[PDB]
Structures are given as C-alpha cells and as structure tokens.
Amino acid sequence: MSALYFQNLPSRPANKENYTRLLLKHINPNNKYAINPSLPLPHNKLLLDDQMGLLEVSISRSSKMTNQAFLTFVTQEEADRFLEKYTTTALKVQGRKVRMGKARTNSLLGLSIEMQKYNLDIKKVLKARKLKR
Amino acid sequence: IQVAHSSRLANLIDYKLRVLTQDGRVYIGQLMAFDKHMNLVLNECIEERVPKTQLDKLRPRGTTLNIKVEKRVLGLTILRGEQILSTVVEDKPLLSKKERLVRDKKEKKQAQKQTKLRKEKEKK
RNA sequence: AUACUUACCUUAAGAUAUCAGAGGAAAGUCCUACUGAUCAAACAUGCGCUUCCAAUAGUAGAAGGACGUUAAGCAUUUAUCAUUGAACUAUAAUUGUUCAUUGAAGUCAUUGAUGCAAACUCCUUGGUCACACACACAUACGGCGCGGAAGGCGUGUUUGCUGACGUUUCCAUUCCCUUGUUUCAAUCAUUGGUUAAUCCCUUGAUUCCUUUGGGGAUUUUUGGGUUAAACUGAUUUUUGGGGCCCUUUGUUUCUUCUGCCUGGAGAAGUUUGACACCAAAUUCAAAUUGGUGUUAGGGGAGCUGGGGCCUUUCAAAAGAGAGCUUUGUAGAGGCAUUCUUUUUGACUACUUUUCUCUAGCGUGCCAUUUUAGUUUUUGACGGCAGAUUCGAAUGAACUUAAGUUUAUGAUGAAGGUAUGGCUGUUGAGAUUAUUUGGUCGGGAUUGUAGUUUGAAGAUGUGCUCUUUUGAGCAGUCUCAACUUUGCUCGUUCCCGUUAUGGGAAAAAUUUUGGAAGGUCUUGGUAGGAACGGGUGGAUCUUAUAAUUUUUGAUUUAU
RNA sequence: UGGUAUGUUC
C-alpha cells in the first residue's frame, strides 16, 4: 500500500501503455506482460500487474514532474523488500540508473486497499476543486 | 510501420517490400520498378525460406515460436510476375518525403539544363 | 564534321471523370472560360487527433544485422547398383554374412549435414534538442516547451491525367548580411524613453506687477518642440575573458586561388556561365572531342499566397411580427346524403355456463398533494471538536527573537472541515395515511336486441362514365396561400394611455456573407498565362479466357 | 520525306 517513488527514468516512451510495459520489462525481464505484446494491461480501480508484489505503475505527463513515476505494491512490506532486491546496486532503465525511495505520501489505490482493509473520494475531489481555485 | 491507405505499387518506389511467392519463399528488398505483369526489380532483396525440418514448429499447438530461417543473399534481381503471390511493406525509404521532393526538383532542373545544352550544341 | 557507298527498318486501334438538369447545332449524337452533385489529383491550411524520436548526475542502452568467433560446441543420423567365383549360416532357387573380379553411373562435404542452446566480439542506425532533479493520481493521471518522422481525419483554392517544345504583335523583371558558435566585460558609434541646464507653445497650482483682462518667474505641471549633463533599453565597430565545437579527417564541403592549430583567415566569383573528374588517340605534358557530376546552409528587408483573432462599414435573416375570428379568391385532398330488408364482417347491451384480484361494498389498484410519519441525496448551507484558518494588522502568554496558542472573530474571503465526523435548518426522490379524485370487472362460450359495413330496393340535384347498391366534376367537408376585419400576446421606438391599443423598424442584440484596417503566424520569391501539333510518358477500354506472366495442374490426393 | 548502322575521302 506504500508507493515507491522513482526519479531519473527516461521521459521519451510517451504512451502510458508502452511506457508501463517497457519499464516492467526492465524491472522483471521475461515477465508475462512484457513478452506478450498486445495483451491488455489490468486497470485496477478502487489483478496483479506483476507477481512478486507489483500492483500498478502510475506516471503523468505533467511538465513539473516528467521522469518521476510511482509504483504501488500490494502491501507495506513488499515496498521495503523491493529496495532489498537492489541490495545497494542501482537498477537501470535504458542507460540511466533509477534512484528510488518510498513516497512522502501513500498512493490513492494504496489508500483504497487499506481502507477496504467513498468519503475519502469526497475529500479528494473537494481538494481538487480547491486546487482549481 | 504505417502505410498510406491510398498507396498503390507505383507509390511504393524505394520502400522495402516483402514479396511472397508460390513456393513459400519470401524476397525482401528495396523496390526499384514494376510492370504490367507485376514483375518487380528488387535492389538488395534477400531470399528467405522455412526448411522442411523447422516447419512443424509452425503447426498449431513455449510462448514464442523460434524458426531458424534459411536465407540466401542475392542482389538486384528481377522477379517474375507469374510466381508472385502477394506483397507487404517492411520499411520506409531512406529519404524523407520532404527530402525526396527536394531531390526531385533538383534533378528536374539539371535534366532540363542538359537537354537545353544538347539542343543549342546541335544547332552549332 | 562534310559528302558518298551499302545494310537494316519506316507503326494495334480508341480514349481523358461520372450522374442529373438548362440551351444550341420524336430518336439518339455533338457541344456549352453553362449550371448542381459525386469522385480524383495538386497546393495551401488546421486539428488539446495517433504512434516514434538514445547515459553524461553517466562508461550505458534500443532497434536491425553479421554472408562473425568460441567450434571438430552438445545430441542424433548418413556414404552406391548390377554380374561372376569362394567360404558360410539354412525351412531355401542358396534369403542372411565375409573376400576378391567385370560393368554402370557418382555435387562438394563427414572438421560435413541436421537438432538444440549459450557466451563473446564487432558493424549500421537515432533530437544523444530546451527547461527541469520536481511528490503525482479515480472522470486515474494539465497530451499547457520547440522541432522532426510516419499515418488518420477536416477545410480552402485550383484543376479534370501529366511533361517537355515552338509562337505571342503576352505578362513577368528585387536586394542585403553571413560560413566556428555562444556569452560576459572594457570601449566607440547610432536610436528611442524620462530627469536636469536656455527655454518656447499649450495649460493645473502658487507668487508678483498692472485696468475686468494680460504678462513675468517657480513647479522646467499637463503633452509637444530647442538642447543633450544623468539614468535605462535595441543595433554596431575594436580588444580581452569564459563555455562548447572542429572526424570540418582534401580542417567548413558553394567553387577557384592564397592559407591555418600560439587558428576558425584573406581575394575573386555564382547558371545560357564557371568548376571538379573520367576516357581515348595523336607517339610525355598541352591540344581537342565525347561523357558524369557540382553550383550549397543560415538570417534579414521588400513583394506575395494561406490561416487564426480583433475593430469598422455594408446586405439578408431572426418579431408590425405571432395567433384567433369574419368576407371574398383560388389551389389540394376526401366523399355526397336518407330509410328499410337480409344479417356477410365488426362493435355494443342483455341471458346460461366456466374461470379470475375478493363474486360484490370496503379492502385492494392507480394519479399525486408535501398535510404527517419513515427512508435516501459527493444535495446545499451554517456551526462545532483537530488550532477553524487566512488578508500576521494589533493586544496578551510561552518564548532573546523567530515560531506557536488565544483574543479583537465577521471587518472580508476560504463549502463546513477533514486526510475517523457530529449537530441543526432547507431542496429533490420513494412509500404510506391523508389534503382528494378515478376504478371494482375482465377473458372463454352461447342465442337475442341495436348501429355500421358485403348484397337488394326506394331515394338524394345536374353533367362525364356505367349492368349497379353506383365512382369523379358543379355539391359538401378538412387544410394551407392571397385579401379585408376587430380581439389577444410580443424584440425595439413613439403616441392614445402605461389597463391596453395604434403606428414604425431592427435604427439596440445575434448568425450568415463581403470590403477595409490592426495583430500574431505559416509558406513562396523566377518564372507564369494563352494558343499549338504527323510531342513524350502515365491511366482506361477493346483485340486478349487458346502453349511465353492475370480467367488455375504446387492444399499431394486415389 | 526519314533513323540507326557501316566504311572510304578530305
């Protein structure tokens, strides 16, 4: 439910479906999704994207935050175990090493998993309307 | 690769084709010319075929099939139209459509100059 | 080069978008710088369109190759046929086995071929762009930096396949900088904007002299002018500094000539021309004739094609209009009419039986008024608890101060506040009881009664048609158009009056079309139009479904 | 009214 935060990713893949699959290949090569193109990816709204804990990726195109992305996992522990896989050796997507750390704010889908473990949505949408001001 | 919906075989000069023949063999090369009988001329076309030993891996049942393909290299061949069965497009041309336009205007200029010269030379 | 000699040739036709409508030379033909609709091509031009565009914060990676190595990798599998003799096993003409002899062919390979898999090395390709080292997101993710590649779709203009060639007694007709780049500073020059010295015009305030008025000075006031001492921005000359680039490898690759690494430079030139290179033979070179190429990249001024947005002006739509009534006109549709018999088809009422919510009144069903209860709404609001905060203005407390807590707390915003919510008021939905209404019979079967249709008769006016109960037109009904009339409403103005009517028109508003101007952008800048033919090439039709390409002998078959 | 080709002469 804790989402990891990634800086220093490549910002030229463009399409989100293509970006997620290419990233996910560099995460776990010979994954189920990465080696069969033209499979639909699961959309899991408030189906694991990948086994060994990976539940969604979430990127944006917003010009403030290009290279950063957020992977959210099943539980709090897999978030810490993923850092363990690196074992102080930096993962690299394309030619750039990805610094990574747990986020300052948990993911929204992670909050949905923990809360099920809609008023929250009311609060978030009112936050969005306040930020539209 | 995306190909224009109204692109006939006259548009696809210098694209890289994928010609299929009756005996199960694929010819891959830059398209140079064609004819009424549909017999092509291919610049760097490389023949490929599936051997009879590799072939039973194609039959319907790992995830991905791996077919070792016997390829021969031949160069500037003319095919015969009777054997051709269907053609598919593999790769775009080297030059861009704008850059192809620039080259064509240049070549028209140079050719007109040369025939103007040949005329005025035969007069004197 | 000429000329001469021979030798070989001197041809498939036809066409140039389609459909419809108007015109010209009853059927068709031809044509229309005619007109609609469709199609196709080119060129501009757009879409919040779709996909793709490589570490330097680093020694990478992506796509495609190798006709590359390890490599005799590891695992399987292949290397003739006939004749004759000899031994040989044997159920056996001697089928099996071995040795030699004659003849016949015979891709090389066995370090091969085939199956499997892995490591390594190397080639080509690319925006290795700009701003960033960022806490995002459920309607899942500002797709809201500039370009480039490729498609999808839309609009506009031109064309009706397209190109050379000739004629015109057609139109056309430009310049400038630059060739490492970028940046900072010193300095020179130019130009604008304000202030300050001589001030002037115009004019707000003051002050002084004089006659209501005028004038002087200050603010050099408001803006302009004289002038340029100060500041600020844009362009330029010279010198220095920093960064990046030079594989630009024939050291900028537009050409020649001069030339270069303590440097990026100098001269001349730019299309009926010049330059580079190739080939020959005269018996080195030069000479000529014949060929293949090159003549570029960036920026600017004019001139011009296109889009978006804004202004003005003009025309048509929307409202002197709309509806309703009255009279006339004319167009279009539909058919007349009445009764009786018969009871063909249909409907309604009553009788018997059967079944159905309860056979019936009520209950039950339906409509819904919010009168009442209940329920619900990311409904809305206000307040509270976490500190309700914030325009941090001010007081006080903890505190050096800062920061925090609280008060002035409605004087104004922030839904309230929370990433658990509570409480109150009000709007909507649903249900019931009601304010109240409507409903309690239907379906099957059965005969009778009534109306209307199938049929007959008497009728009902005249004509056309006709065997007729008869169909169309004068006849009658319904609907729209024109003309007159008062009533009702209405966008704008005026009047009678602000009950309402009368009159006028968009002159106020919008959308559509056009002209002009402004702004921003995007493209072009040396050919273009018209005419023409024993002109080239594309597309189309017909010869042509008869052995050489497209009107079937490659689904391995019985 | 032509084309290509050939070889000779100058």
The verdict on B100 and B49 lying in the same domain is: no
Obtained via which technique?
Answer: cryo-EM
The verdict on B62 and B116 lying in the same domain is: no
CB-neighbour burial class of residue A88 (10 A; exposed 0-12, middle 13-18, buried 19+) = exposed
Closest CA to A83 of A101, A69, A71, A97: A101
The verdict on B44 and B70 lying in the same domain is: yes
- Å from the B54 CA to the C504 C1': 96
Question: Rounded CA gap, A5 and A58, in Å?
Answer: 10
The verdict on B62 and B97 lying in the same domain is: no
Domain that holds residue B112: 93-124
Q: How many whole angstroms from its chain centre is CA B26? A: 12
The verdict on B83 and B103 lying in the same domain is: no
Q: Which position has the token pair 């993962």? A: A91
How many domains does chain B fold into?
2
- Contact predicate B42/B19, CB 8 Å: yes
Q: Number of C-alpha atoms within 13 angstroms, CB side, residue B9? A: 18
The verdict on B115 and B63 lying in the same domain is: no
Q: Is A55 near strand C, with its CB below 7 A from some atom of it?
A: no
Give the three-state DSSP class for B31: strand
Please list every residue in chain A whose beta carbon sits closer than 8 Å to the beta carbon of residue B63: 35-36
The verdict on B15 and B75 lying in the same domain is: yes
Q: Which two tokens stand for residue B74?
A: 């031949």
The verdict on B29 and B46 lying in the same domain is: yes
Question: Rounded CA gap, A109 and A112, in Å?
Answer: 5
Q: Which two tokens stand for residue B38?
A: 């549909």
H/E run at residue A85: helix A76-86
The verdict on B75 and B121 lying in the same domain is: no
Question: Rounded CA gap, A45 and A102, in Å?
Answer: 22
Question: Rounded CA gap, A113 and A73, in Å?
Answer: 10
The verdict on B12 and B37 lying in the same domain is: yes
Question: Rounded CA gap, A99 and A94, in Å?
Answer: 14
Q: Pick out residues 30-69 of chain B having their CB under 7 A from any atom of nucleic acid strand C.
A: 35, 37-39, 46, 51, 53-54, 57, 66, 68
Q: Is A114 near strand C, with its CB below 7 A from some atom of it?
A: no
Phi and psi at residue A65, in whole multiples of 5°? -125, 90
DSSP result, B63-93: -S-----EEEE--SEE--TTTEEEEEEEE--
The verdict on B72 and B55 lying in the same domain is: yes
- Å from the B110 CA to the D6 C1': 35
- Contact predicate A29/A44, CB 8 Å: no
Q: Name beta bridge partners: A4.
A: A71, A102
Please list every residue in chain A whose beta carbon sits closer than 8 Å to the beta carbon of residue B64: 35
Question: Rounded CA gap, B3 and A79, in Å?
Answer: 45
The verdict on B19 and B75 lying in the same domain is: yes
